[PDB]
Design a protein around this ligand. Structure first.
Ligand code: NAG
Length: 542
Protein backbone atom coordinates (compact mmCIF):
# COMPACT_ATOMS: atom_id res chain seq x y z
CA UNK A 1 0.00 0.00 0.00
CA UNK A 2 3.08 2.21 -0.38
CA UNK A 3 3.79 1.33 -4.01
CA UNK A 4 0.35 2.33 -5.32
CA UNK A 5 -0.30 5.69 -3.65
CA UNK A 6 3.04 7.12 -4.83
CA UNK A 7 2.69 10.08 -7.17
CA UNK A 8 4.91 10.44 -10.25
CA UNK A 9 6.71 13.57 -11.43
CA UNK A 10 5.07 13.32 -14.86
CA UNK A 11 1.53 13.92 -13.53
CA UNK A 12 2.77 17.08 -11.79
CA UNK A 13 5.05 18.55 -14.46
CA UNK A 14 4.27 17.22 -17.96
CA UNK A 15 0.48 16.72 -17.83
CA UNK A 16 -0.42 20.40 -17.06
CA UNK A 17 1.06 21.81 -20.28
CA UNK A 18 -0.06 18.96 -22.55
CA UNK A 19 -3.58 19.51 -21.21
CA UNK A 20 -3.28 23.27 -21.76
CA UNK A 21 -1.90 22.87 -25.30
CA UNK A 22 -4.81 20.63 -26.40
CA UNK A 23 -7.42 22.62 -24.48
CA UNK A 24 -9.36 21.63 -21.38
CA UNK A 25 -11.84 18.77 -21.36
CA UNK A 26 -11.20 17.68 -24.95
CA UNK A 27 -7.88 16.12 -23.85
CA UNK A 28 -9.41 13.94 -21.12
CA UNK A 29 -11.61 11.71 -23.32
CA UNK A 30 -8.77 10.25 -25.46
CA UNK A 31 -6.62 10.18 -22.32
CA UNK A 32 -9.14 8.12 -20.30
CA UNK A 33 -9.96 5.82 -23.23
CA UNK A 34 -6.28 5.08 -23.89
CA UNK A 35 -5.64 4.82 -20.14
CA UNK A 36 -8.18 2.05 -19.65
CA UNK A 37 -7.85 0.18 -22.94
CA UNK A 38 -4.08 0.06 -23.33
CA UNK A 39 -2.55 1.05 -20.01
CA UNK A 40 -4.42 -1.19 -17.61
CA UNK A 41 -3.85 -4.49 -19.51
CA UNK A 42 -0.27 -3.52 -20.37
CA UNK A 43 0.55 -2.40 -16.82
CA UNK A 44 -0.82 -5.70 -15.50
CA UNK A 45 1.12 -7.66 -18.14
CA UNK A 46 4.40 -5.91 -17.31
CA UNK A 47 3.83 -6.49 -13.60
CA UNK A 48 3.14 -10.20 -14.17
CA UNK A 49 6.03 -10.77 -16.59
CA UNK A 50 8.86 -9.73 -14.27
CA UNK A 51 7.49 -11.43 -11.16
CA UNK A 52 7.42 -14.89 -12.78
CA UNK A 53 10.77 -14.93 -14.62
CA UNK A 54 12.83 -13.07 -11.96
CA UNK A 55 14.71 -11.26 -14.73
CA UNK A 56 15.33 -7.70 -15.87
CA UNK A 57 14.15 -5.90 -18.98
CA UNK A 58 16.80 -7.46 -21.23
CA UNK A 59 17.07 -10.99 -19.82
CA UNK A 60 13.30 -11.58 -19.54
CA UNK A 61 13.32 -12.53 -23.24
CA UNK A 62 14.46 -16.10 -22.64
CA UNK A 63 10.95 -17.20 -23.70
CA UNK A 64 11.45 -15.87 -27.26
CA UNK A 65 15.08 -15.05 -28.18
CA UNK A 66 14.11 -12.93 -31.22
CA UNK A 67 12.69 -10.16 -28.99
CA UNK A 68 15.76 -9.10 -26.99
CA UNK A 69 16.06 -6.04 -29.23
CA UNK A 70 12.93 -4.66 -27.55
CA UNK A 71 14.58 -5.04 -24.14
CA UNK A 72 17.64 -3.25 -25.47
CA UNK A 73 15.51 -0.46 -26.97
CA UNK A 74 13.55 0.21 -23.77
CA UNK A 75 16.84 0.47 -21.85
CA UNK A 76 18.17 2.92 -24.47
CA UNK A 77 14.99 5.02 -24.17
CA UNK A 78 15.30 5.04 -20.37
CA UNK A 79 18.88 6.28 -20.74
CA UNK A 80 17.76 9.00 -23.16
CA UNK A 81 14.98 10.32 -20.92
CA UNK A 82 17.18 10.50 -17.81
CA UNK A 83 19.35 12.97 -19.71
CA UNK A 84 16.65 15.64 -19.37
CA UNK A 85 14.90 14.60 -16.18
CA UNK A 86 18.02 15.95 -14.42
CA UNK A 87 17.57 19.52 -15.71
CA UNK A 88 14.09 19.75 -14.14
CA UNK A 89 15.54 18.74 -10.76
CA UNK A 90 18.28 21.34 -11.24
CA UNK A 91 15.62 23.99 -11.91
CA UNK A 92 13.71 22.88 -8.81
CA UNK A 93 16.85 23.15 -6.67
CA UNK A 94 17.61 26.61 -8.06
CA UNK A 95 14.04 27.72 -7.31
CA UNK A 96 14.26 26.28 -3.77
CA UNK A 97 17.49 28.18 -3.06
CA UNK A 98 15.77 31.40 -4.22
CA UNK A 99 12.87 31.08 -1.75
CA UNK A 100 14.88 31.82 1.43
CA UNK A 101 13.87 35.47 1.57
CA UNK A 102 10.89 37.64 2.49
CA UNK A 103 10.75 39.24 -1.00
CA UNK A 104 10.25 36.62 -3.70
CA UNK A 105 12.13 37.37 -6.94
CA UNK A 106 9.08 36.65 -9.14
CA UNK A 107 6.81 39.28 -7.55
CA UNK A 108 8.39 42.59 -8.64
CA UNK A 109 10.12 43.66 -11.83
CA UNK A 110 12.94 45.97 -10.77
CA UNK A 111 15.88 43.57 -10.74
CA UNK A 112 18.96 43.31 -12.98
CA UNK A 113 17.40 40.64 -15.25
CA UNK A 114 14.42 42.81 -16.23
CA UNK A 115 13.75 44.26 -19.68
CA UNK A 116 12.34 47.77 -20.17
CA UNK A 117 9.26 46.11 -21.69
CA UNK A 118 8.06 44.74 -18.34
CA UNK A 119 4.78 45.83 -16.74
CA UNK A 120 3.59 45.06 -13.19
CA UNK A 121 -0.21 44.66 -12.88
CA UNK A 122 -0.17 45.68 -9.22
CA UNK A 123 1.80 48.84 -10.07
CA UNK A 124 -0.08 49.55 -13.30
CA UNK A 125 -0.35 41.15 -31.16
CA UNK A 126 -3.54 39.10 -30.77
CA UNK A 127 -2.52 35.46 -31.28
CA UNK A 128 0.85 35.85 -29.54
CA UNK A 129 2.31 34.72 -26.21
CA UNK A 130 2.56 37.12 -23.27
CA UNK A 131 6.00 37.03 -21.66
CA UNK A 132 6.55 40.51 -20.13
CA UNK A 133 5.22 39.53 -16.68
CA UNK A 134 7.66 39.48 -13.73
CA UNK A 135 7.34 35.71 -13.30
CA UNK A 136 7.86 34.91 -16.99
CA UNK A 137 10.76 37.37 -17.21
CA UNK A 138 12.31 35.80 -14.11
CA UNK A 139 11.99 32.28 -15.52
CA UNK A 140 13.35 33.31 -18.92
CA UNK A 141 16.18 35.65 -17.86
CA UNK A 142 17.38 34.72 -14.37
CA UNK A 143 17.50 30.92 -14.44
CA UNK A 144 17.65 30.17 -18.19
CA UNK A 145 19.41 33.22 -19.69
CA UNK A 146 17.53 32.49 -22.92
CA UNK A 147 17.94 36.10 -24.08
CA UNK A 148 21.59 35.49 -25.08
CA UNK A 149 20.53 32.72 -27.49
CA UNK A 150 18.92 33.22 -30.91
CA UNK A 151 18.23 29.58 -31.72
CA UNK A 152 19.44 26.00 -31.69
CA UNK A 153 22.21 27.03 -34.11
CA UNK A 154 23.63 29.34 -31.40
CA UNK A 155 23.38 27.83 -27.92
CA UNK A 156 26.43 29.32 -26.18
CA UNK A 157 28.26 28.04 -23.08
CA UNK A 158 26.69 26.32 -20.05
CA UNK A 159 25.51 28.50 -17.18
CA UNK A 160 27.54 27.92 -14.03
CA UNK A 161 24.63 28.50 -11.63
CA UNK A 162 22.74 25.52 -13.12
CA UNK A 163 25.97 23.52 -13.39
CA UNK A 164 26.55 23.80 -9.64
CA UNK A 165 23.03 22.43 -9.05
CA UNK A 166 23.43 19.59 -11.56
CA UNK A 167 26.68 18.57 -9.85
CA UNK A 168 24.85 18.26 -6.51
CA UNK A 169 21.95 16.36 -8.11
CA UNK A 170 24.22 13.78 -9.76
CA UNK A 171 26.30 13.33 -6.58
CA UNK A 172 23.13 12.68 -4.55
CA UNK A 173 21.92 10.24 -7.21
CA UNK A 174 25.24 8.36 -7.17
CA UNK A 175 25.47 8.11 -3.39
CA UNK A 176 21.87 6.86 -3.29
CA UNK A 177 22.67 4.07 -5.79
CA UNK A 178 26.08 2.61 -4.98
CA UNK A 179 25.39 0.10 -2.17
CA UNK A 180 22.28 -1.83 -3.23
CA UNK A 181 19.28 -2.22 -5.50
CA UNK A 182 16.67 -0.72 -3.19
CA UNK A 183 18.16 2.22 -1.22
CA UNK A 184 14.66 3.65 -0.76
CA UNK A 185 13.75 3.00 2.88
CA UNK A 186 13.85 6.71 3.73
CA UNK A 187 11.93 8.44 0.92
CA UNK A 188 8.70 6.48 0.42
CA UNK A 189 6.54 8.49 2.82
CA UNK A 190 7.40 12.01 1.60
CA UNK A 191 6.59 11.20 -2.03
CA UNK A 192 3.12 9.85 -1.17
CA UNK A 193 1.97 12.23 1.59
CA UNK A 194 3.18 15.73 0.67
CA UNK A 195 1.93 16.06 -2.95
CA UNK A 196 -1.63 15.26 -1.88
CA UNK A 197 -1.57 18.00 0.78
CA UNK A 198 -0.03 20.48 -1.68
CA UNK A 199 -2.66 19.84 -4.36
CA UNK A 200 -5.47 19.81 -1.78
CA UNK A 201 -4.50 23.25 -0.47
CA UNK A 202 -3.84 24.65 -3.95
CA UNK A 203 -7.20 23.43 -5.30
CA UNK A 204 -9.14 25.34 -2.64
CA UNK A 205 -6.95 28.40 -3.07
CA UNK A 206 -7.44 28.35 -6.85
CA UNK A 207 -11.21 27.89 -6.70
CA UNK A 208 -11.49 30.81 -4.28
CA UNK A 209 -9.46 33.09 -6.57
CA UNK A 210 -11.27 35.75 -8.64
CA UNK A 211 -11.74 35.02 -12.33
CA UNK A 212 -11.13 31.29 -11.84
CA UNK A 213 -14.66 30.43 -13.00
CA UNK A 214 -13.75 31.63 -16.51
CA UNK A 215 -11.07 28.94 -16.42
CA UNK A 216 -13.25 26.25 -14.88
CA UNK A 217 -15.89 26.76 -17.58
CA UNK A 218 -13.03 26.37 -20.05
CA UNK A 219 -11.83 23.09 -18.49
CA UNK A 220 -15.34 21.60 -18.39
CA UNK A 221 -16.10 22.73 -21.95
CA UNK A 222 -15.66 19.95 -24.51
CA UNK A 223 -14.42 21.05 -27.92
CA UNK A 224 -15.42 18.69 -30.72
CA UNK A 225 -13.51 20.08 -33.71
CA UNK A 226 -10.37 19.79 -31.56
CA UNK A 227 -10.93 16.03 -31.86
CA UNK A 228 -10.65 14.17 -35.21
CA UNK A 229 -7.04 15.38 -35.21
CA UNK A 230 -3.96 13.23 -34.62
CA UNK A 231 -2.17 15.54 -32.17
CA UNK A 232 -4.50 14.99 -29.20
CA UNK A 233 -4.47 11.18 -29.52
CA UNK A 234 -0.70 11.02 -30.01
CA UNK A 235 -0.18 13.26 -26.96
CA UNK A 236 -2.63 11.22 -24.87
CA UNK A 237 -1.01 7.84 -25.59
CA UNK A 238 2.49 9.19 -24.97
CA UNK A 239 1.42 10.86 -21.71
CA UNK A 240 -0.13 7.57 -20.61
CA UNK A 241 3.18 5.80 -21.29
CA UNK A 242 4.89 8.35 -19.06
CA UNK A 243 2.38 8.47 -16.21
CA UNK A 244 2.04 4.70 -15.86
CA UNK A 245 5.70 4.04 -16.62
CA UNK A 246 5.34 1.13 -19.08
CA UNK A 247 7.88 1.08 -21.90
CA UNK A 248 10.93 2.10 -19.87
CA UNK A 249 11.88 -1.20 -18.21
CA UNK A 250 11.19 0.12 -14.70
CA UNK A 251 8.17 -2.12 -13.97
CA UNK A 252 9.86 -5.33 -15.14
CA UNK A 253 13.04 -4.54 -13.19
CA UNK A 254 11.21 -3.68 -9.96
CA UNK A 255 8.76 -6.60 -10.18
CA UNK A 256 11.67 -9.08 -10.27
CA UNK A 257 12.33 -8.37 -6.58
CA UNK A 258 8.81 -9.17 -5.31
CA UNK A 259 7.52 -12.30 -3.57
CA UNK A 260 6.04 -15.16 -5.58
CA UNK A 261 2.53 -14.59 -4.14
CA UNK A 262 2.06 -10.94 -5.07
CA UNK A 263 -1.28 -9.80 -6.49
CA UNK A 264 -0.59 -7.62 -9.54
CA UNK A 265 -4.26 -7.20 -10.53
CA UNK A 266 -5.05 -5.20 -7.37
CA UNK A 267 -1.91 -3.09 -7.82
CA UNK A 268 -2.77 -2.29 -11.45
CA UNK A 269 -6.35 -1.30 -10.58
CA UNK A 270 -5.25 0.91 -7.67
CA UNK A 271 -2.47 2.57 -9.69
CA UNK A 272 -4.78 3.33 -12.62
CA UNK A 273 -7.51 4.78 -10.38
CA UNK A 274 -5.08 6.96 -8.42
CA UNK A 275 -3.38 8.15 -11.62
CA UNK A 276 -6.71 9.17 -13.15
CA UNK A 277 -7.85 11.02 -10.02
CA UNK A 278 -4.55 12.89 -9.66
CA UNK A 279 -4.54 13.86 -13.34
CA UNK A 280 -8.08 15.26 -13.12
CA UNK A 281 -7.30 17.20 -9.93
CA UNK A 282 -4.08 18.60 -11.42
CA UNK A 283 -5.91 19.78 -14.53
CA UNK A 284 -8.63 21.49 -12.48
CA UNK A 285 -6.05 23.25 -10.29
CA UNK A 286 -4.00 24.34 -13.31
CA UNK A 287 -6.99 25.80 -15.13
CA UNK A 288 -8.22 27.72 -12.07
CA UNK A 289 -4.85 29.50 -11.88
CA UNK A 290 -4.92 30.01 -15.66
CA UNK A 291 -8.29 31.74 -15.37
CA UNK A 292 -7.05 33.95 -12.54
CA UNK A 293 -3.93 34.92 -14.52
CA UNK A 294 -6.04 35.73 -17.58
CA UNK A 295 -8.30 37.89 -15.41
CA UNK A 296 -5.47 39.85 -13.79
CA UNK A 297 -3.42 40.55 -16.95
CA UNK A 298 -6.46 41.54 -19.09
CA UNK A 299 -5.59 38.93 -21.72
CA UNK A 300 -7.12 35.69 -23.03
CA UNK A 301 -6.58 32.23 -21.57
CA UNK A 302 -5.01 30.83 -24.76
CA UNK A 303 -2.52 33.74 -24.80
CA UNK A 304 -1.69 34.24 -21.11
CA UNK A 305 1.02 31.57 -20.70
CA UNK A 306 3.37 29.41 -22.74
CA UNK A 307 2.87 25.79 -23.82
CA UNK A 308 6.34 24.48 -22.98
CA UNK A 309 8.04 22.52 -20.22
CA UNK A 310 8.25 25.57 -17.95
CA UNK A 311 4.53 26.16 -17.50
CA UNK A 312 4.52 25.07 -13.84
CA UNK A 313 7.57 27.22 -12.98
CA UNK A 314 5.47 30.24 -14.01
CA UNK A 315 1.95 29.42 -12.81
CA UNK A 316 2.71 27.70 -9.50
CA UNK A 317 4.96 30.50 -8.15
CA UNK A 318 2.28 32.98 -9.23
CA UNK A 319 -0.38 31.09 -7.25
CA UNK A 320 1.97 30.83 -4.25
CA UNK A 321 2.28 34.63 -3.97
CA UNK A 322 -1.48 34.98 -3.35
CA UNK A 323 -1.37 32.92 -0.13
CA UNK A 324 -0.54 33.98 3.43
CA UNK A 325 3.06 33.27 4.32
CA UNK A 326 4.24 32.62 0.77
CA UNK A 327 7.83 31.79 1.76
CA UNK A 328 6.80 28.70 3.76
CA UNK A 329 4.57 27.38 0.97
CA UNK A 330 7.20 27.95 -1.73
CA UNK A 331 9.78 26.02 0.31
CA UNK A 332 7.35 23.14 0.89
CA UNK A 333 6.31 23.02 -2.77
CA UNK A 334 9.86 23.05 -4.15
CA UNK A 335 10.90 20.40 -1.62
CA UNK A 336 8.04 18.29 -2.97
CA UNK A 337 9.26 18.81 -6.54
CA UNK A 338 12.82 17.89 -5.57
CA UNK A 339 11.69 14.68 -3.86
CA UNK A 340 9.50 13.68 -6.82
CA UNK A 341 12.29 14.26 -9.33
CA UNK A 342 14.82 12.37 -7.21
CA UNK A 343 12.45 9.40 -6.90
CA UNK A 344 11.82 9.30 -10.66
CA UNK A 345 15.53 9.52 -11.49
CA UNK A 346 16.33 6.79 -8.96
CA UNK A 347 13.72 4.54 -10.56
CA UNK A 348 15.16 5.10 -14.02
CA UNK A 349 18.71 4.44 -12.82
CA UNK A 350 17.60 1.22 -11.11
CA UNK A 351 15.89 0.12 -14.32
CA UNK A 352 18.95 0.77 -16.51
CA UNK A 353 21.50 -0.68 -14.08
CA UNK A 354 19.51 -3.84 -13.35
CA UNK A 355 18.75 -4.43 -17.03
CA UNK A 356 22.39 -4.08 -18.04
CA UNK A 357 23.76 -6.10 -15.11
CA UNK A 358 21.37 -9.04 -15.55
CA UNK A 359 22.86 -9.79 -18.98
CA UNK A 360 26.59 -9.45 -18.21
CA UNK A 361 27.47 -11.09 -14.90
CA UNK A 362 30.87 -9.37 -14.62
CA UNK A 363 29.05 -6.09 -13.89
CA UNK A 364 27.52 -7.63 -10.75
CA UNK A 365 30.98 -7.74 -9.10
CA UNK A 366 31.75 -4.08 -9.97
CA UNK A 367 28.69 -2.05 -8.99
CA UNK A 368 30.43 1.15 -7.88
CA UNK A 369 32.29 1.46 -11.20
CA UNK A 370 29.13 0.83 -13.23
CA UNK A 371 27.10 3.33 -11.20
CA UNK A 372 29.86 5.93 -11.53
CA UNK A 373 29.97 5.37 -15.28
CA UNK A 374 26.21 5.71 -15.70
CA UNK A 375 26.01 8.84 -13.55
CA UNK A 376 29.01 10.50 -15.21
CA UNK A 377 27.66 9.77 -18.69
CA UNK A 378 24.28 11.20 -17.67
CA UNK A 379 25.97 14.34 -16.32
CA UNK A 380 28.08 14.81 -19.46
CA UNK A 381 25.08 14.38 -21.76
CA UNK A 382 22.90 16.66 -19.61
CA UNK A 383 25.53 19.41 -19.84
CA UNK A 384 24.03 20.18 -23.28
CA UNK A 385 20.66 21.27 -21.84
CA UNK A 386 22.03 23.80 -19.32
CA UNK A 387 23.52 26.11 -21.97
CA UNK A 388 22.16 29.56 -22.81
CA UNK A 389 19.92 27.97 -25.45
CA UNK A 390 19.31 24.66 -23.71
CA UNK A 391 15.52 24.95 -23.77
CA UNK A 392 15.52 24.16 -27.51
CA UNK A 393 17.64 21.05 -26.94
CA UNK A 394 15.37 20.01 -24.05
CA UNK A 395 12.26 20.49 -26.21
CA UNK A 396 13.78 18.42 -29.03
CA UNK A 397 14.67 15.69 -26.52
CA UNK A 398 11.24 15.70 -24.85
CA UNK A 399 9.69 15.45 -28.33
CA UNK A 400 11.84 12.74 -29.93
CA UNK A 401 13.33 10.58 -27.14
CA UNK A 402 10.07 8.77 -26.31
CA UNK A 403 7.61 9.40 -29.13
CA UNK A 404 6.90 6.79 -31.78
CA UNK A 405 9.81 4.81 -30.30
CA UNK A 406 8.10 4.00 -26.99
CA UNK A 407 4.82 3.12 -28.73
CA UNK A 408 6.70 0.80 -31.10
CA UNK A 409 8.51 -0.86 -28.19
CA UNK A 410 5.27 -1.35 -26.24
CA UNK A 411 3.51 -2.74 -29.33
CA UNK A 412 6.40 -5.16 -29.95
CA UNK A 413 6.34 -6.38 -26.33
CA UNK A 414 2.61 -7.15 -26.48
CA UNK A 415 2.79 -8.75 -29.94
CA UNK A 416 5.80 -10.86 -28.98
CA UNK A 417 4.37 -12.16 -25.72
CA UNK A 418 0.74 -12.66 -26.70
CA UNK A 419 1.38 -14.18 -30.14
CA UNK A 420 4.64 -16.12 -29.88
CA UNK A 421 4.90 -17.19 -26.24
CA UNK A 422 1.17 -17.83 -25.87
CA UNK A 423 -1.65 -16.03 -24.08
CA UNK A 424 -2.59 -19.45 -22.69
CA UNK A 425 0.87 -20.05 -21.21
CA UNK A 426 0.93 -16.49 -19.85
CA UNK A 427 -2.45 -17.18 -18.22
CA UNK A 428 -1.34 -20.55 -16.81
CA UNK A 429 1.66 -18.79 -15.23
CA UNK A 430 -0.65 -16.38 -13.38
CA UNK A 431 -2.73 -19.43 -12.45
CA UNK A 432 0.44 -20.91 -10.93
CA UNK A 433 1.64 -17.82 -9.07
CA UNK A 434 -1.69 -16.27 -8.04
CA UNK A 435 -4.22 -19.12 -7.95
CA UNK A 436 -6.75 -17.63 -10.38
CA UNK A 437 -6.79 -17.37 -14.16
CA UNK A 438 -6.91 -13.77 -15.52
CA UNK A 439 -10.17 -13.81 -17.48
CA UNK A 440 -11.67 -13.15 -20.90
CA UNK A 441 -11.40 -9.34 -20.86
CA UNK A 442 -7.67 -9.30 -20.09
CA UNK A 443 -6.91 -12.10 -22.56
CA UNK A 444 -8.73 -10.22 -25.33
CA UNK A 445 -7.16 -6.83 -24.54
CA UNK A 446 -3.71 -8.47 -24.45
CA UNK A 447 -4.01 -10.02 -27.92
CA UNK A 448 -6.41 -8.03 -30.12
CA UNK A 449 -7.51 -4.68 -28.69
CA UNK A 450 -4.29 -3.05 -27.42
CA UNK A 451 -2.05 -4.06 -30.38
CA UNK A 452 -4.54 -2.65 -32.91
CA UNK A 453 -4.77 0.74 -31.16
CA UNK A 454 -0.98 0.88 -30.74
CA UNK A 455 -0.42 0.09 -34.43
CA UNK A 456 -2.97 2.74 -35.43
CA UNK A 457 -1.32 5.35 -33.21
CA UNK A 458 2.15 4.45 -34.53
CA UNK A 459 1.03 4.73 -38.16
CA UNK A 460 -0.83 8.01 -37.63
CA UNK A 461 2.12 9.56 -35.74
CA UNK A 462 4.23 9.03 -38.88
CA UNK A 463 1.59 10.00 -41.44
CA UNK A 464 0.72 13.29 -39.69
CA UNK A 465 4.08 14.47 -38.32
CA UNK A 466 4.26 18.19 -37.49
CA UNK A 467 7.47 20.25 -37.67
CA UNK A 468 8.97 21.18 -34.32
CA UNK A 469 8.24 24.59 -32.80
CA UNK A 470 8.76 26.33 -29.46
CA UNK A 471 6.26 29.16 -28.91
CA UNK A 472 7.07 31.66 -31.68
CA UNK A 473 10.33 29.92 -32.66
CA UNK A 474 10.50 27.60 -35.68
CA UNK A 475 13.28 25.01 -35.85
CA UNK A 476 15.27 24.48 -39.06
CA UNK A 477 14.65 21.22 -40.97
CA UNK A 478 18.01 19.68 -40.00
CA UNK A 479 16.82 19.80 -36.39
CA UNK A 480 13.86 17.65 -37.45
CA UNK A 481 16.25 15.26 -39.21
CA UNK A 482 18.39 15.06 -36.06
CA UNK A 483 15.28 14.32 -33.98
CA UNK A 484 14.13 11.59 -36.36
CA UNK A 485 17.60 10.03 -36.23
CA UNK A 486 17.39 9.93 -32.44
CA UNK A 487 13.90 8.41 -32.65
CA UNK A 488 15.06 5.73 -35.10
CA UNK A 489 18.21 4.89 -33.11
CA UNK A 490 16.10 2.91 -30.62
CA UNK A 491 13.59 1.53 -33.13
CA UNK A 492 16.30 0.02 -35.37
CA UNK A 493 17.62 -2.21 -32.56
CA UNK A 494 14.78 -4.75 -32.94
CA UNK A 495 15.33 -5.90 -36.57
CA UNK A 496 19.11 -6.03 -35.99
CA UNK A 497 18.92 -8.66 -33.24
CA UNK A 498 16.63 -10.89 -35.33
CA UNK A 499 19.26 -10.93 -38.10
CA UNK A 500 22.18 -11.40 -35.70
CA UNK A 501 20.55 -14.32 -33.87
CA UNK A 502 19.47 -15.93 -37.15
CA UNK A 503 23.00 -15.72 -38.56
CA UNK A 504 24.63 -16.88 -35.31
CA UNK A 505 22.63 -20.13 -35.11
CA UNK A 506 23.74 -23.16 -37.12
CA UNK A 507 21.58 -25.67 -38.97
CA UNK A 508 19.04 -25.49 -41.76
CA UNK A 509 16.29 -22.87 -42.04
CA UNK A 510 13.88 -25.02 -40.02
CA UNK A 511 16.29 -25.47 -37.09
CA UNK A 512 17.41 -21.83 -37.04
CA UNK A 513 13.79 -20.64 -37.08
CA UNK A 514 12.73 -23.12 -34.38
CA UNK A 515 15.60 -22.27 -32.02
CA UNK A 516 14.62 -18.58 -31.96
CA UNK A 517 10.94 -18.85 -30.99
CA UNK A 518 11.40 -21.67 -28.43
CA UNK A 519 12.21 -20.95 -24.75
CA UNK A 520 15.87 -21.54 -23.86
CA UNK A 521 14.99 -24.17 -21.23
CA UNK A 522 12.98 -26.20 -23.79
CA UNK A 523 15.66 -26.33 -26.51
CA UNK A 524 15.86 -30.14 -26.15
CA UNK A 525 12.45 -30.36 -27.86
CA UNK A 526 13.79 -28.96 -31.15
CA UNK A 527 15.65 -32.15 -32.12
CA UNK A 528 12.46 -34.15 -31.43
CA UNK A 529 10.25 -32.01 -33.73
CA UNK A 530 7.88 -30.90 -30.96
CA UNK A 531 7.42 -27.18 -31.67
CA UNK A 532 3.98 -25.84 -30.76
CA UNK A 533 4.32 -22.72 -32.94
CA UNK A 534 4.27 -24.89 -36.10
CA UNK A 535 0.59 -25.71 -35.46
CA UNK A 536 -2.56 -23.74 -36.23
CA UNK A 537 -4.16 -24.49 -32.85
CA UNK A 538 -1.43 -22.39 -31.24
CA UNK A 539 -2.31 -19.35 -33.36
CA UNK A 540 -6.08 -19.83 -32.98
CA UNK A 541 -5.93 -19.70 -29.17
CA UNK A 542 -7.81 -16.68 -27.82
C1 NAG B 1 9.86 46.32 -26.57
O1 NAG B 1 9.41 47.66 -26.56
C2 NAG B 1 10.07 48.45 -27.56
C3 NAG B 1 9.44 49.82 -27.52
O2 NAG B 1 9.30 50.37 -28.82
C4 NAG B 1 9.95 47.78 -28.93
O3 NAG B 1 11.23 47.32 -29.35
C5 NAG B 1 8.96 46.61 -28.90
O4 NAG B 1 7.64 47.10 -28.71
C6 NAG B 1 9.30 45.61 -27.80
N1 NAG B 1 10.24 44.61 -28.29
C7 NAG B 1 9.88 43.37 -28.63
C8 NAG B 1 10.98 42.47 -29.11
O5 NAG B 1 8.71 42.99 -28.54
Amino acid sequence: SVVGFAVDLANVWRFPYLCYKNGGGAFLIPYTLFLIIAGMPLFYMELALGQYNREGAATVWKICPFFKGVGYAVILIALYVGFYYNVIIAWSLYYLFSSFTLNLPWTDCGHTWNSPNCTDPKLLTKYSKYKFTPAAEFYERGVLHLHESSGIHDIGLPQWQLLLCLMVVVIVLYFSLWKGVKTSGKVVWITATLPYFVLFVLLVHGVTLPGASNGINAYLHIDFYRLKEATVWIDAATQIFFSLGAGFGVLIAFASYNKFDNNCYRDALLTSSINCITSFVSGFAIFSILGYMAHEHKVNIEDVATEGAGLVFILYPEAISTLSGSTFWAVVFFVMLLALGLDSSMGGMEAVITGLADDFQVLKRHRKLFTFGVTFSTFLLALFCITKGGIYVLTLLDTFAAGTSILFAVLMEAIGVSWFYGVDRFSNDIQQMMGFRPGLYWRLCWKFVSPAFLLFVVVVSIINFKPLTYDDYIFPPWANWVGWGIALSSMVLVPIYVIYKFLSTQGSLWERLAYGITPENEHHLVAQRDIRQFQLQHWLAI
